[PDB]
Design an enzyme around this catalytic site. Structure first.
Site, short mmCIF file in Angstrom:
data_model
loop_
_atom_site.label_atom_id
_atom_site.label_comp_id
_atom_site.label_asym_id
_atom_site.label_seq_id
_atom_site.Cartn_x
_atom_site.Cartn_y
_atom_site.Cartn_z
N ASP A 1 68.08 2.37 108.32
CA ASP A 1 69.51 2.16 108.49
C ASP A 1 70.25 3.29 107.78
O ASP A 1 69.66 4.30 107.38
CB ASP A 1 69.92 0.78 107.98
CG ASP A 1 69.82 0.66 106.47
OD1 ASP A 1 68.99 1.36 105.86
OD2 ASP A 1 70.57 -0.15 105.88
P1 8Q1 Z 1 74.02 1.02 107.59
O1 8Q1 Z 1 73.10 0.25 108.53
O2 8Q1 Z 1 74.99 1.92 108.33
O3 8Q1 Z 1 74.92 -0.09 106.85
C1 8Q1 Z 1 75.97 0.35 105.95
C2 8Q1 Z 1 76.77 -0.87 105.50
C3 8Q1 Z 1 75.93 -1.69 104.53
C4 8Q1 Z 1 78.04 -0.40 104.79
C5 8Q1 Z 1 77.14 -1.72 106.72
O4 8Q1 Z 1 75.98 -2.34 107.26
C6 8Q1 Z 1 78.22 -2.76 106.46
O5 8Q1 Z 1 79.39 -2.52 106.77
N1 8Q1 Z 1 77.84 -3.92 105.95
C7 8Q1 Z 1 78.77 -4.99 105.63
C8 8Q1 Z 1 78.56 -5.54 104.23
C9 8Q1 Z 1 78.65 -4.48 103.16
O6 8Q1 Z 1 78.95 -3.32 103.43
N2 8Q1 Z 1 78.38 -4.86 101.90
C10 8Q1 Z 1 78.34 -3.95 100.78
C11 8Q1 Z 1 79.39 -4.28 99.74
S1 8Q1 Z 1 79.40 -3.16 98.32
C12 8Q1 Z 1 77.94 -3.66 97.46
O7 8Q1 Z 1 76.91 -3.95 98.01
C13 8Q1 Z 1 78.12 -3.69 95.97
C14 8Q1 Z 1 76.87 -3.39 95.20
C15 8Q1 Z 1 77.09 -3.33 93.70
C16 8Q1 Z 1 75.89 -2.88 92.90
C17 8Q1 Z 1 76.13 -2.80 91.42
C18 8Q1 Z 1 74.97 -2.29 90.60
C19 8Q1 Z 1 75.25 -2.25 89.12
C20 8Q1 Z 1 74.13 -1.70 88.27
C21 8Q1 Z 1 74.40 -1.78 86.79
C22 8Q1 Z 1 73.33 -1.24 85.89
C23 8Q1 Z 1 73.12 0.25 86.00
#
Ligand code: 8Q1
Ligand code: 8Q1
Ligand code: FES
Ligand code: FE2
Ligand code: FE2
Lengths: 81, 74, 103, 124, 400, 402, 81, 124, 74
Positions: free
Chosen positions: B34
């Protein structure tokens, strides 16, 4: 908002690999990848924005901690040889 | 050899058994990848060769051939 | 030159023992069977000559040596009247002193 | 510190004194039970049974200054019977005083009552 | 916009040198100092032992005499309660002062509830105890004597060396609470004949939540442990030793030992400046405590006919402290200012000024100007000021 | 080149998020939280209350039930000693376990010199107490029951909820030492009927020198204060509250609540990985503790015919711990291993492995490989192995010396 | 000597003027100036070299702490206006 | 983590076994697994009456293994009477053993004495 | 006015009371200032006038005339 999430993912991955400590670097990379994969199918835009804001705050924390660990660095682990 | 190294990097990143990568195989359709795996592949390419890929040129890297051409050109 | 002391064993038995000036309290026990071990034999390295001195006669004893205090620190059931038997020498001031053996 | 207490100190309302020799002025001067709080509350009455002026001077905490200032504001514009109704509960509900701070409101009420009794005694 | 800090007696800011020494143990060297099997524990133990040597060097003592604690409260609790409980069979009497810190006073009150006898020595109007009263208060069954070095409320220094000589002549253990004196005035446990001393980390620009207690080994003072556990710190204080905190304590002690003479000169000059500039422009202002035996970093002034917390509220851009009974959670008056014989009117009017390592002439002058203007304002507001200026004496006036 | 860290039970590394939360209060917000008149004190107090709320949210309690301490040792001391001394007019009996941490055991033994009666419950060979024995050990004058949640040496889990329900039925206060369980397994004081709980900061990737104790308010549990002073922390623990430390502890608790489900899953798969690869390559390796009621992060293994300290010395590139008398400063054998019916031969052969949040698969594989090769080397060096391979019986073999 | 000491003085002052905190900036500037004032008449080259080494270590500490304070900054004081 | 102790541990020198069923071989086996350190020290006295070979196998802590290795090194190429002169104090001095780990040196001394005694009760 | 600002900066740095400063007075010979004084005078000049003065020109700045010429040229 796919491009924004991809750019944030790329920035978070790039900044985490600059961690001086082995444990922090490996944990940060693995946690970022797992957290982004676990929320791949989220549909609600409000939840997506909440996750984006959480990731932005985590990115700021990662930047500060990576730099302060670069200021105070030690020898590498035996496994990194 | 650049030709072997690029395919080998893709093999580590996508778990392709080193057989599926060809000169015409796409990242998304042909292989299991992906957008999240493509970002990780681009970063790995930027690490094996200490060449930094602009975002505009990173978008163009969708197949093995695109990465091969980018690495050979630079 | 005879000084009389009292030995209280681990089970509360007062054993009157008569000694002379210049003797060692620890050795004054085994001669009369009071069960003090004194493994190091006055080497100040085992602290098994532990004993409780009577409150009145405790102040008369000379100050303990630094190695004696180092051993006393580890000594189980430490009290404010705790001394080491190997370092106590009978003197005329010590008449009527009572030595109690720690458990 | 609370917004209203801070405002009541930072902006003086009726900080002053009134002529005690004047027959139409009642003066109260009371003190806290277990701390160094002292309030001077003075009220003035015109020809009719209406309070036209009231001045205060307080040696005490910020909450005591604010309590005395609110007391002089509320006293101004009323009559003696309408001012006898003011209680420390109302003062505390206005200033949002914590439980450790009820002495200031009680002292302000005591000052009001003393000033009213003083007015009655001199007007006799 | 943040206000100025002039409250160094409550707590001090962290020294950047101390933070630079602390951070490596907060990032890379996170091992347990009691782990004897690996390099993490080995290096943590090495850092702890160095920190111990630094504290000992500062107070002029042997490193084996230093026990790390969680603060001066626990250090005072250990000293007092441990000495009293260990020497219980023969000694059941304790001596302390009425101007001591609340940890010491509460430990003594608890021991009084525990069947001990405690004498509280009054002070003179200068804050200093009477040595003759000390000698007349010692009994054949006296266990401990506790007098603080520098008072946290009024900043008066006690004759520590004379007290220690008296105690050693009478064969009585002498504990001193030096949480306000360490790194600020010279201290030598051997010249002063001190048997126990309490040390606080966050009073010497070190980290909070860490302290130390000195216990003499020649002649050996013994205490009864209060915290049970696995016998860390020679069995006197059980529990894991916090390596970053002890490292910060050692760094702060070393920095203080290097900076003491310069800091004292600077703080004395700034304290003369503040006191003179306040007195020359405000009548009826009195300093609490004797200036002849006074630490210049703690200044306590009473502004007559002005209430302490109202003055503090007026001085919103300066962080200060007051002895007013209206700043207390339990409406408690200042027992120190009651002990030194201050009237209640002037005890509710007391303001504590704190000058420290990072205080500036700019801050001092700003504080002086603000104080002058706001005291003039509150005096124009005060009925006590009204009556005093109108030829009336406060004592003669009836009060209800 | 530094060794790998596999000793999370002794202490944990500081989480970078916790340090990020702590740093503003080590630089700018240095005020005293008990300062009532200026803004430094107000902001410090606000941070302290926020951290208290975070801890309460982690353990499912009210914020008013949280008291900050200097560690789990101080928390255990406060719990046991204050509960015993407050209720000693009618309650003179205490109950605890033989496998408890030394702070609890030493507090109980110091209470025995004060006139109290203390019962030390034995454990089964699994390391779990029998509830029938606990019920039979409760007296009308019993004051407190103290059973730890997760053992720090073998990692077994006690039935905390059942113990709490028994104690509530018998009207006996229940204390649990959760310094190895907070942030790692779910905890709820109301569902488990817990009256007192001990919390350690540096066992949950927080700063050292800070802890907390939970004291139930309904029904009210009262303790006798051990540290005298100005009446801070509801009069239960006097002294200045270390604002950076409590802020770090609260941040640690908030991170633990968010990350406990992922950490537990991946630690379980790492522990399964480690145990399976050691067992399949080394004969005569035994795990200490019931595998059913076990926390995966704490693994205790005995390697027959190899002494623990020598194996630790061989693993100079891995930071670990043992339960051998030869590792103790006083030659003290592990009492936890003795209490679970481990014969003395295998008590000197025990090694403790620790898996945390920051442990990688590469570290586990490296440790397993080094352990296999060094155990083989030491067994080829051992006389016990030589006799066993010869067909001789070590138990029948009498010992020429001691 | 003169050249190296002057350059070290300039670098220390430059780095100390970049403190984000008022308590730390003023104290560092004042302390550097007073120390170079008090050590102006030293003649022993060994003592001079020890002083330069101490100043170098203090410069390192100042650089690290100044950057960390820039990472965690707060509002200016009321007197900086 | 003494340099001398781990020197013998990572490079143990005479590790092995010898034929117990031999006229010119003495076998020592002292210590108990319950105590935590067990040593098997074996010597081979030649026809001249001078130890020619020595082997050891030790179950115990690292200081015990270092002590056993040093014992095998020291008692090789010496007379039995000269081998009896070895005390635990010499081994502790050489290995810089702390007081807590003197049990290793004493146990090694007992192992040497036991092997010598086995030879003295077998050669007849 | 650059002349007045430079004179004010020099007077504030060196305590010359604003009258002993002239267009031919040296920093060390005429006015009472050492090298440590000169370093902060130059740093104050760099603070007031935003300019990263190189070391060569900084050592060339020894007089008020030199400082005035430098500031006016840059
Ligand atoms: P790809 O197949 O093109 O897909 C891309 C995405 C995932 C963007 C697409 O599939 C999509 O639009 N999905 C919808 C849901 C989405 O995008 N969710 C993501 C939200 S942001 C997220 O996941 C936050 C993660 C936070 C991680 C924090 C880590 C902290 C670590 C601390 C210690 C070092
Ligand atoms: P200029 O007059 O031409 O030259 C002046 C000097 C001092 C260079 C000249 O007089 C000289 O050569 N003197 C000889 C002695 C000398 O060189 N003295 C200075 C030596 S270096 C020194 O003094 C180091 C001072 C260290 C200061 C540490 C400050 C720490 C601050 C900590 C903040 C947290
Ligand atoms: S006999 Fe060992 S100390 Fe006296
Ligand atoms: Fe008040
Ligand atoms: Fe051993």
């Amino acid at each position: 908002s796919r491009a924004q999430v991809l750019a944030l993912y790329r920035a978070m991955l790039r900044e985490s690999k600059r961690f001086s400590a082995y444990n922090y670097r490996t944990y940060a990379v693995r946690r970022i990848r797992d957290a982004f994969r676990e929320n791949k199918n989220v549909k609600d835009p409000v939840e997506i924005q909440t996750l984006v804001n959480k990731a932005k705050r985590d990115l700021g924390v990662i930047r500060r901690q990576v730099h302060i660990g670069q200021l105070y660095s030690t020898d590498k682990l035996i496994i990194e040889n | 050899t650049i030709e072997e190294r690029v395919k080998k990097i893709i093999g580590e990143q996508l778990g392709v058994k080193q057989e599926e990568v060809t000169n015409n195989a796409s990242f998304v359709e042909d292989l299991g990848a992906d957008s999240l795996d493509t970002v990780e592949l681009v970063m790995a390419l930027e690490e094996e060769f200490d060449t930094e890929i602009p975002d505009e040129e990173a978008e163009k890297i969708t197949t093995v051939q695109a990465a091969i051409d980018y690495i050979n050109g630079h | 030159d005879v000084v009389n002391v009292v030995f209280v064993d681990r089970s509360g038995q007062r054993i009157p023992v008569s000694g002379r000036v210049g003797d060692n309290v620890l050795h004054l026990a085994q001669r009369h069977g009071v069960d003090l071990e004194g493994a190091c034999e006055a080497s100040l390295a085992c602290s098994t000559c532990h004993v409780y001195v009577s409150e009145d006669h405790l102040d008369l004893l000379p100050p303990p040596e630094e190695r004696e205090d180092d051993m006393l620190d580890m000594a189980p059931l430490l009290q404010e009247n705790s001394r080491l038997g190997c370092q106590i020498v009978l003197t005329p001031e010590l008449e009527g002193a009572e030595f109690t053996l720690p458990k | 510190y609370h917004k209203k207490v801070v405002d009541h100190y930072e902006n003086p309302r009726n900080v002053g004194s009134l002529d005690k020799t004047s027959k139409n002025v009642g003066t109260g001067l009371v003190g806290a039970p277990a701390c160094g709080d002292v309030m001077k509350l003075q009220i003035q009455v015109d020809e009719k049974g209406k309070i036209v002026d009231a001045r205060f001077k307080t040696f005490g905490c910020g909450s005591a200054i604010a309590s005395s200032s609110l007391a002089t504001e509320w006293v101004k514009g009323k009559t003696v019977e309408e001012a006898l109704t003011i209680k420390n509960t109302d003062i505390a509900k206005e200033l949002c005083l914590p439980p450790v701070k009820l002495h200031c409101s009680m002292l302000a009420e005591d000052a009001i009552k003393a000033a009213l009794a003083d007015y009655k005694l001199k007007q006799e | 916009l943040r206000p100025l800090y002039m409250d160094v007696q409550a707590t001090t800011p962290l020294d950047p040198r101390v933070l630079d020494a602390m951070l490596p143990y907060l990032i890379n060297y996170y091992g347990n100092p009691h782990s004897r099997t690996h390099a993490y524990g080995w290096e943590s133990e090495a850092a702890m032992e160095r920190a111990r040597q630094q504290v000992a060097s500062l107070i002029g003592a042997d490193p084996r005499e230093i026990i790390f604690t969680s603060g001066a409260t626990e250090s005072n609790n250990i000293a007092i309660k441990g000495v009293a409980r260990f020497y219980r069979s023969r000694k059941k009497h304790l001596i302390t002062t009425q101007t001591e810190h609340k940890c010491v006073l509460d430990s003594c009150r608890s021991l009084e509830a525990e069947g001990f006898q405690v004498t509280y020595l009054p002070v003179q109007k200068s804050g200093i105890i009477d040595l003759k009263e000390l000698e007349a208060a010692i009994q054949p069954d006296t266990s401990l004597v506790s007098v603080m070095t520098v008072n946290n409320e009024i900043g008066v220094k006690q004759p520590i060396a004379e007290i220690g000589r008296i105690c050693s002549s009478r064969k009585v253990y002498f504990h001193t609470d030096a949480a306000q004196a360490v790194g600020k005035i010279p201290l030598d446990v051997n010249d002063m004949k001190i048997d126990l001393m309490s040390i606080s980390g966050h009073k010497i620009y070190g980290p909070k939540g860490v302290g130390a207690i000195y216990i003499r080994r020649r002649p050996r003072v013994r205490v009864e442990a209060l915290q049970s556990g696995g016998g860390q710190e020679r069995g006197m204080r059980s529990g894991t030793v916090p390596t970053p905190l002890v490292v910060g304590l050692g760094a702060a002690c070393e920095v203080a030992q290097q900076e003491m003479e310069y800091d004292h000169k600077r703080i004395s000059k700034l304290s003369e400046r503040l006191i003179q500039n306040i007195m020359k422009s405000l009548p009826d202002v009195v300093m609490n405590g004797d200036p002849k035996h006074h630490y210049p970093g703690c200044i306590n002034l009473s502004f007559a006919y002005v209430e302490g917390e109202s003055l503090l509220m007026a001085l919103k851009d300066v962080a200060l402290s007051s002895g007013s009974a209206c700043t207390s959670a339990s409406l408690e008056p200042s027992y120190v200012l009651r002990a030194i014989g201050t009237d209640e009117d002037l005890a509710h009017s007391s303001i504590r000024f704190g000058i420290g390592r990072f205080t500036t002439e700019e801050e001092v002058d700003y504080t002086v100007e603000k104080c002058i203007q706001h005291v003039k304002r509150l005096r124009e507001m005060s009925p006590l000021w009204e009556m005093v200026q109108d030829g009336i004496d406060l004592k003669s006036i009836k009060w209800t």
